[PDB]
């Protein structure tokens, strides 16, 4: 037993990380087959960031202007193109450690592991969620751009996030691996703000099921609720609406514990209206919303990769 915020094993991703340097600007890139993917702001200097014309800046770059290093091995760039907000550097050797992989665009509320990297080398791994406002609450310093978020299914790595920038209040914004930003953001040093964030209700419910499986059941009440009545209260506390699809996604956890979703909802409504009165759930004094139902199932059943 026990319950912790668990990241995917990072070995398959670590073998793909390289350093990309364009003059004084350096960040991380992802070396898959014979292509290195990286944020296009690597071609910027510090002055160019306020309002960069990326096409003009890249026309002035030759293949040799890109210094790509995989540890000790310098890699020769033999072509380059820009796709949306990512650069694609064709290199003259295919990465021998390339795993089986997919590019996916995740939905808000979904989670993934981030491999934080500087100068092409990993510093750490942690799990995070795509917030409803299309930011993530990561831990990223200057140099971390190009670090990637991913999920694993057996042997296939799904890359879903490339890091690009930090927004006010310390939240983070990036792209999918096709180079389209999550949310209404642009890779410019301009005034941009994350919008109002909400609490991912289906994830809170998954976490309360996790608590029940681990024997923390003090918050279980005896009432039930309707979906519509639940969503009236949730909305008041800045929770996302629970949909019937969400109720169905919670089905396996509900079956395991014998607690109908609408009964768990009745218990969440009381927590929201009355607080926790100094108590904790799973060691936490706030409700946690960064475990999906699949995350709970994986951790509580021990799925491996």
């Amino acid at each position: 037993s026990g319950f912790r915020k668990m990241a995917f094993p990072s070995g398959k991703v670590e073998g793909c990380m390289v350093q990309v340097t364009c003059g004084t600007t350096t960040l991380n890139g992802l070396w898959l087959d014979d292509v290195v993917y990286c944020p296009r702001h690597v071609i910027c200097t510090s002055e160019d960031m306020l309002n960069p014309n990326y096409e003009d800046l890249l026309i002035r770059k030759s293949n040799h202007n890109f210094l790509v290093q995989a540890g000790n091995v310098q890699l020769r760039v033999i072509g380059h193109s820009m796709q949306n907000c990512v650069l694609k550097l064709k290199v003259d050797t295919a990465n021998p450690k390339t795993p089986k992989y997919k590019f996916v665009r995740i939905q808000p509320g979904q989670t993934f592991s981030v491999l934080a990297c500087y100068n092409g080398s990993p510093s750490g791994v942690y799990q995070c969620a795509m917030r409803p406002n299309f930011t993530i609450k990561g831990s990223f310093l200057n140099g971390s751009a190009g670090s990637v978020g991913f999920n694993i299914d057996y042997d296939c790595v799904s890359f879903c996030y490339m890091h690009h920038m930090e927004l006010p209040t310390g939240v983070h914004a990036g792209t999918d691996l096709e180079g389209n930003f999550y949310g209404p953001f642009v890779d410019r040093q301009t005034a941009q703000a994350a919008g109002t964030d909400t609490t991912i209700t289906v994830n809170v419910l998954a976490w309360l099921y996790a608590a029940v499986i681990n024997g923390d059941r003090w918050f279980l009440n005896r009432f039930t609720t309707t979906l519509n009545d639940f969503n009236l209260v949730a909305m008041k506390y800045n929770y996302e609406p629970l949909t019937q699809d969400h109720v169905d996604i919670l089905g396996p956890l509900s079956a395991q514990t014998g607690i109908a979703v609408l009964d768990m909802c009745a218990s969440l409504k009381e927590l929201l209206q009355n607080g926790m009165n100094g108590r904790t759930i799973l060691g936490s004094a706030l409700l946690e919303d960064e475990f999906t139902p699949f995350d709970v199932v994986r951790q509580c059943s021990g799925v491996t990769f």
Binding site: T24, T25, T26, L27, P39, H41, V42, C44, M49, Y118, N119, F140, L141, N142, G143, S144, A145, H163, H164, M165, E166, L167, P168, A173, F185, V186, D187, R188, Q189, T190, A191, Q192
Partner: peptide
């Protein structure tokens, strides 16, 4: 404002 997280 938004800050691009490349490095020096």
């Amino acid at each position: 404002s938004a800050v691009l997280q490349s490095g020096f």
